[PDB]
Amino acid sequence: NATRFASVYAWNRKRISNCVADYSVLYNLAPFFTFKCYGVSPTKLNDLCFTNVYADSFVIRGDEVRQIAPGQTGNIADYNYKLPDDFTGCVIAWNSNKLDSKVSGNYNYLYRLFRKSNLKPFERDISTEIYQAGNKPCNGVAGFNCYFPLRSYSFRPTYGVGHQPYRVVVLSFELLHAPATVCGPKKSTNLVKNKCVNFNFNGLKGTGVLTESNKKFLPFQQFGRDIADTTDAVRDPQTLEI
Amino acid sequence: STIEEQAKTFLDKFNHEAEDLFYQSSLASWNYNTNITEENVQNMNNAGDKWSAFLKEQSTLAQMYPLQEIQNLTVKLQLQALQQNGSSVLSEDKSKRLNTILNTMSTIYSTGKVCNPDNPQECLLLEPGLNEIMANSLDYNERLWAWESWRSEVGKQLRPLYEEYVVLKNEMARANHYEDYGDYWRGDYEVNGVDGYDYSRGQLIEDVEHTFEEIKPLYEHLHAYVRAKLMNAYPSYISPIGCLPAHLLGDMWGRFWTNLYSLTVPFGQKPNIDVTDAMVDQAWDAQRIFKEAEKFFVSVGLPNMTQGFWENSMLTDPGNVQKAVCHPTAWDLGKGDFRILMCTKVTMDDFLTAHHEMGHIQYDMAYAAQPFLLRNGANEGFHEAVGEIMSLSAATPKHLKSIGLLSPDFQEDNETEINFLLKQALTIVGTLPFTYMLEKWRWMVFKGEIPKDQWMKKWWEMKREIVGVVEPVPHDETYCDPASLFHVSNDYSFIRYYTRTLYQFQFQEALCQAAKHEGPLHKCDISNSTEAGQKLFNMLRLGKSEPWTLALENVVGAKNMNVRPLLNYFEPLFTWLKDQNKNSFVGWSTDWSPYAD
């Protein structure tokens, strides 16, 4: 929900690490235009989580959302950015006709359509290289069969479905050998007392009766044990009470 | 560094402001057609000159080393639409004079003022005025004024203005390694790089001649049917042996024969098929007429449209304070978007153009992720040939029953479809030899084999042996009959209307062979068939990445331009015009003249 963004070859690295993800206001409300992705379903992201999450901010056409796919070739998918075969993220697009556009042409952020070679996945290429396709060199200018790359946007909110400003935020997920740091929301239930019920806590699982405790405790603890090494205490994960 | 690895990187800093400098002249021309103010015309000029200089700034810096090192087929087919230098190969006094002669040629065509020389005290406006007085005036002296005087006050100074315009037009194309400007319209038809499917520009001269030989039995029976029905209207003006006069064809020149339908009715006891009387009872508005017409696009198998089409484009004229020009043009404004500006009324001709102008949207929708040089037609006439397949399928009485339009018990005999097919004969077949004799006139005055005195004498000698009309007065070498139209004065291509009627018929003859329709092809409707879109989806997405020779292989399978879909579409029209022409004269002759008294 930013007010600015970046180019598709000048991708910033929003390093989401050591966070708590809240998808009850973003995924469940869904104020975006389309909500469709592959690999991992968005309903599995609340019950499964990953090591490092990386994000970006880039606005493209509505015709280039078919190019954002794992294993895709074509116009954008080999020359501006590339999605790998192990892509476990999701791609969300939203029409930004009232925010990201500009009257009298949008001449500020640039994008490409071709390249010298096939780039690597998540490659930040900001080069202004000189091309030479034939047998005579170009000395820095374009020519017959000599071309150059670097031109900006054409956004305006008065037209149809093809090249409206669509803000695409690719939330790339990555599971490594390191333990997880950023995970999604998980619903809670009510708490009943003075009854033989089961326990499903944040770090406890068992069956017992919840009564009022009269002992002292440390707030950085999860549970406590008695003199016979049995679990006789539980801290609430929401409130500071045992 | 390797020669084989380097394919194509032109589309970075060319193909992103080829739209964007045209974008700033796109809405500025669109606001010129909706909000005609004093400052909404100035933004067309300074932004359109930036895009006009963009095609000449990169052309001067593309003059280094030649073409023959390329290997890929995708490189060469987009290279032909950029290496045309245009006007930038002439001098400073010759190239900029072409820009000034094109602005004075479109001004007097739109703002012309010509009226009666007998009583010039009341002098009227041309374009809403003279377009509608041709239909209702049943007089010989009244129709003589609207054809002769219009080329006598507007077209009198174009004859010393078109002679040096042709001479400068030869210099800009002979330096572009072509033989003439005559193959500049045939430069889009040039196919090279594929073995077995090579279509040169010299092959197109015999191909229009090959498809014109078999239309001469079909056109001369329509030439003898309008003439035989004008005996009770004009008893002593039109000869039964000779040709028809050219000042009574219904329009300003005689391209369309649409106003000659009400006078040549075959049977007056049965009513015509009409949506206009049944529209005002159910109270339709502007939201209905595009939504059920877009239901025709879903039922073949093309996907839906989002909210950007309904809140941006309007269908109602924005008040009576501000003037809005509403000519039917589907706005192809760059890399796959369409805003529709149409002054819609309760009119059957407005209803068929709702399917026509949305048929140019569905061609550019499929290659919306393709480059802009491939975002075009397969030729110039390929864009409007795939647009009117939705209008001829919506004029079918089997389609009107499934929606809820006309009466559910309507009689359909053999004498019902003949009045519909002769309405299509003056829309499709009636403009077909008229497209031939003007494009052959364009291909005979550009090469320069003829002198200046045979410039206009060759024009009226072709019309008495190709289309079968004769002028009532003779013209000298100071007037111009073909140069008073919309396409020739604003420098547009006229080859695109001969291939409009040919590529449309090739697609509709095979579309319900997939949908399994038994009967004639004027009862063919392409709706309620999900497998009918899959034959089109490999054709709607090929644009100019594949040429027009390989584009016809997946529907009809003919690599050449043939006339055989045009014959069995009109199979009651070939049989029922034969028995009524037993005693009249078949064809025309070159001896009758109205001024040879």
Curated annotation (Swiss-Prot), chain A:
Record annotation: effect of changing residue 26 to I: In strain: Omicron/XBB.1.5, Omicron/EG.5.1
Consequence when changing residue 111 to F: In strain: B.1.1.298
Effect in UniProt of substituting residue 1 to Q: Reduced viral infectivity
Domain BetaCoV S1-CTD: 1-185
Region (Receptor-binding domain (RBD)): 1-199
Outcome of mutating residue 110 to Q: In strain: Omicron/BA.2.12.1
Effect after changing residue 110 to R: In strain: Delta/B.1.617.2, Epsilon/B.1.427/B.1.429, Kappa/B.1.617.1, Lambda/C.37, 19B/501Y, Omicron/BA.4, Omicron/BA.5, Omicron/BQ.1.1; Contributes to cellular immunity evasion and increases infectivity
Impact reported for residue 133 to V: Increased resistance to neutralizing antibodies
Region Integrin-binding motif: start-end pairs: 61-63
Disulphide bond pairs: 37-90, 49-183, 138-146
Effect upon mutating residue 148 to S: In strain: Lambda/C.37, Omicron/BQ.1.1, Omicron/XBB.1.5, Omicron/EG.5.1
Region described as Receptor-binding motif: spans on this chain: 95-166
Start and end residues of each stretch annotated as Disordered: 113-148, 177-199
Segments of this protein annotated with the region Immunodominant HLA epitope recognized by the CD8+: 106-114
Residues carrying covalently attached carbohydrate according to the record: 1
Effect of residue 114 to L: In strain: Omicron/EG.5.1
Record function comment: Attaches the virion to the cell membrane by interacting with host receptor, initiating the infection. The major receptor is host ACE2. When S2/S2' has been cleaved, binding to the receptor triggers direct fusion at the cell membrane. When S2/S2' has not been cleaved, binding to the receptor results in internalization of the virus by endocytosis using host TFRC and GRM2 and leading to fusion of the virion membrane with the host endosomal membrane. Alternatively, may use NRP1/NRP2 and integrin as entry receptors.
Assembly and oligomerization: Binds to host ACE2. RBD also interacts with the N-linked glycan on 'Asn-90' of ACE2. Cleavage of S generates a polybasic C-terminal sequence on S1 that binds to host Neuropilin-1 (NRP1) and Neuropilin-2 (NRP2) receptors. Interacts with host integrin alpha-5/beta-1 (ITGA5:ITGB1) and with ACE2 in complex with integrin alpha-5/beta-1 (ITGA5:ITGB1). May interact via cytoplasmic c-terminus with M protein. May interact (via N-terminus) with host bilirubin and biliverdin, thereby preventing antibody binding to the SARS-CoV-2 spike NTD via an allosteric mechanism.
Name of protein: Spike protein S1
Boundaries of the shown chain within the full protein: 343 to 584 of 1273
From Swiss-Prot, chain B:
UniProt note on tissues of expression: Expressed in endothelial cells from small and large arteries, and in arterial smooth muscle cells (at protein level). Expressed in enterocytes of the small intestine, Leydig cells and Sertoli cells (at protein level). Expressed in the renal proximal tubule and the small intestine (at protein level). Expressed in heart, kidney, testis, and gastrointestinal system (at protein level). In lung, expressed at low levels in some alveolar type 2 cells, the expression seems to be individual-specific (at protein level). Expressed in nasal epithelial cells (at protein level).
Membership in a protein family: Belongs to the peptidase M2 family.
Outcome, altering residue 51 to V: Increases slightly the interaction with RBD domain of SARS-CoV-2 spike protein
Organism this protein belongs to: Homo sapiens (Human)
Protein name: Angiotensin-converting enzyme 2
Notes on activation and inhibition: Regulated by chloride and fluoride, but not bromide. Chloride increases angiotensin I and decreases angiotensin II cleavage. Inhibited by MLN-4760, cFP_Leu, and EDTA, but not by the ACE inhibitors lisinopril, captopril and enalaprilat. Highly potent and selective in vitro ACE2 inhibitors were identified.
Residue positions binding Zn(2+): 356, 360, 384
Post-translational modification: N-glycosylation on Asn-72 may limit SARS infectivity. Proteolytic cleavage by ADAM17 generates a secreted form. Also cleaved by serine proteases: TMPRSS2, TMPRSS11D and HPN/TMPRSS1.
Membrane topology: Single-pass type I membrane protein
Gene Ontology cellular component list: apical plasma membrane; brush border membrane; cell surface; cilium; endocytic vesicle membrane; endoplasmic reticulum lumen; extracellular exosome; extracellular region
Region listing for Interaction with SARS-CoV spike glycoprotein, in residue ranges: 12-23, 64-66, 335-339
Span covered, complete protein: 19 to 615 of 805
UniProt subunit comment: Homodimer. Interacts with the catalytically active form of TMPRSS2. Interacts with SLC6A19; this interaction is essential for expression and function of SLC6A19 in intestine. Interacts with ITGA5:ITGB1. Interacts (via PDZ-binding motif) with NHERF1 (via PDZ domains); the interaction may enhance ACE2 membrane residence. (Microbial infection) Interacts with SARS coronavirus/SARS-CoV spike protein.
Effect caused by changing residue 585 to T: No effect on interaction with SARS-CoV spike glycoprotein
Gene from which the chain derives: ACE2
Phenotype upon changing residue 255 to Q: Complete loss of enzyme activity. Does not affect amino acid transport activity of SLC6A19
Effect of residue 337 to A: Strongly inhibits interaction with SARS-CoV spike glycoprotein
Record annotation: effect of changing residue 500 to G: Increases very slightly the interaction with RBD domain of SARS-CoV-2 spike protein
A single GO molecular function term of this UniProt record: identical protein binding
